[PDB]
Design a protein around this ligand. Structure first.
Ligand code: RBF
Ligand code: RBF
Ligand code: RBF
Lengths: 258, 258, 258
């Protein structure tokens, strides 16, 4: 909307359109957490807090009127800036097919780690708890290709004592996955037809259920690009967003110690 | 709605209808603050916080990604209980026209002071500031019937240096008003045709403008009555509500020191 | 119109609309002269002089061809600048209801004295004469509440020896009006049903007739706001206007000496 002052920057339609496509491609492969959690739809640029449904009592013991306060979670807002070069950007109109956009890509890669760190390890100043802190759901595994199958078979018998079902997914580390490569068809069918995700963000493995409604991400505004000011022969732009995160049912998650 | 468990109490329609009318009459004359402020419509039993439109920065000085948190005001919830007598309540069906309801009236009178205290003096634990703490809007007055007219004429020349207009109202203490009784027609027309409100809640006088949009009260749920449990030969009931308060433009208010 | 370069400033529609309303309110109460004089409609941004209907002869005494020049009044143009803060202005989109606009109000108050000074005391370099320089229309008054009524009754017998009639108005000083407060209904009906105006711009009183067509103010362009240039993190704006003033019939004015 209008709060991103896009019409006041000296660029053309083709130049604006060439900048969005490059960032949309990297955001699609570098956001690992968004592949197995739920997303609650956007509320707007004015939303500020999300309700927790409880009261805390502050009055004394022997009083006629008694009172307290309600509870909530506050959202987080971010902002990051970069700069580009005008004479280099202007060859697109003469007809050059490969213009150099190298400052955009480093910033796009650094913004993507900030969100995954909050999802996997919490914040401690906004009141958020991450996935790797629930230490009461753990089983010890070994380091031979048979132990992987044995641990996967043992993990589905704990989901049964509760009423948990649905498709199941494996999330594992990319250096560990190299030494288990000979057994790939066996795992997929022992998982009853699930899927595997490799990532550099953790050091061990975890198993989750995907029936729906256990891990949610709340958004106010999605990721956006805007204009700030002009310099000698460069231009200055920024990226922004607002969000928060929550875990509801901790019985759909299991950690593998290795 | 259903969260007040009214259908599970052993009473009839006439008995329920006779209890609401008595409280509705006292609430209409004992709520003094609601006669010159604005009321924002009810949102519901789940509303929890109201937005302040600002951000607070928490990151360090030299970083690539910078962040902060948004700001809000939390609401207040109250609850008060009382008890009544069944054999006495049952004479309404035999045809008695004056049944004794004496425990209801003390509780109704004590709930009404709690709200006026917040409006006139703040809370200090929810982050609320009341009307009598803005000390930069004050003028000294005297104690002779001419000084009242002189101070009222002086107070309308300060409203003019800003763009403030509209009808004006006087709020004064009831023991002070006794000694100014001979001049009543003069005040009403010197006020350009305003109105006067006497109250036991303060000790001096104040003047306010009533053009609209300067002092607001935000409600989640209005004042309601519900049922709790049964005892030997009595029944137990309660009253409840949720709210908060704000002052926007401090240039529509003036205090008279006397 | 287009000579105010409004489209080149980095603001939104709501931000522009919030700035006009605040100035429109103060201009409505701080322009005292415009309450009893006439206004001749606007001519445009190119108007330059207004005709006086006379000729001045410059040739010699014994010549066959004789000649001279015509006479006029030139208009006055003004300009005043101020600056504002962008991050503070940007909270209106997050939802803040009271944004601080403190530099605008001082400039608006200082522009309003400049016009009243010309109307009440003349210019001496454009050829303008003000209301307080016609010294042949004066009567001496006293300082007791009866002398006010006596002087008002005497002043209406001078309007009768000429053919002057119509409603009559009193313009008086605000510290003097305090000591005459007990007689207010008497004055209004002795004035035959007129009106009273209090002001801090003079030191005595005057009486004028309001039949129409004796004191006129000529405008080229009304009061307007425009954009100049951008700074580090602020923006710079200005206010402008063009006008002149004239008195036609000096027999509709009387001064009270006190
Ligand atoms: C032939 C020629 C073409 C140029 N084209 C551009 C251009 O497309 N964009 C640009 O910013 N500067 C261009 N410049 C340079 C630019 O005019 C100048 O060096 C700086 O903008 C400072 O005046 C060009 C210079 C020359 C000699
Ligand atoms: C003639 C009579 C009428 C009564 N009516 C009522 C009544 O309307 N409501 C009531 O709670 N108790 C009533 N009681 C008393 C009640 O039955 C009893 O004392 C207590 O409820 C304990 O059993 C009545 C008792 C008598 C003797
Ligand atoms: C979270 C955050 C939000 C900001 N929002 C704004 C803004 O709305 N307008 C603004 O001019 N500057 C804003 N700034 C600061 C701005 O980017 C920077 O300090 C100066 O504009 C110089 O780069 C913000 C900074 C942070 C950290």
């Amino acid at each position: 909307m209008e709060f991103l002052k896009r019409s006041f920057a000296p660029l053309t339609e083709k130049q604006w359109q060439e900048i969005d496509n490059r960032a949309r491609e990297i955001f699609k492969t570098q956001l690992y957490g968004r592949k197995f959690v739920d997303v609650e739809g956007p509320y707007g640029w004015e939303y500020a807090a999300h309700p927790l449904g409880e009261v805390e009592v502050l009055s004394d013991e022997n009083e006629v009127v008694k009172w307290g306060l309600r509870k909530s979670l506050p959202l987080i807002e971010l902002r990051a800036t970069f700069t580009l070069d005008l004479w280099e950007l202007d060859n697109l109109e003469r007809g050059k097919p490969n213009v150099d956009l190298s400052s955009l890509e480093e910033t796009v890669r650094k913004v993507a780690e900030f969100e995954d760190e909050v999802i996997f390890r919490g914040c401690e100043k906004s009141g958020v708890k991450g996935l790797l802190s629930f230490e009461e759901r753990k089983i010890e595994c070994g380091s031979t290709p048979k132990d992987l199958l044995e641990a996967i078979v043992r993990a589905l018998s704990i989901f049964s004592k509760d009423g948990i079902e649905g498709p199941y997914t494996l999330v594992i580390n990319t250096d560990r996955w190299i030494n288990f490569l000979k057994e790939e068809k066996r795992v997929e069918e022992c998982l009853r037809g699930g899927k595997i995700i490799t990532t550099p963000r953790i050091e061990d493995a975890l198993v989750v259920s995907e029936r729906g409604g256990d891990f949610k991400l709340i958004l106010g505004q999605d990721l956006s690009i805007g204009y700030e000011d002009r310099e000698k022969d460069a231009v200055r732009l920024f990226i922004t967003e607002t969000f928060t995160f929550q875990v509801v049912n901790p019985e759909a998650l299991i950690l593998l110690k290795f």
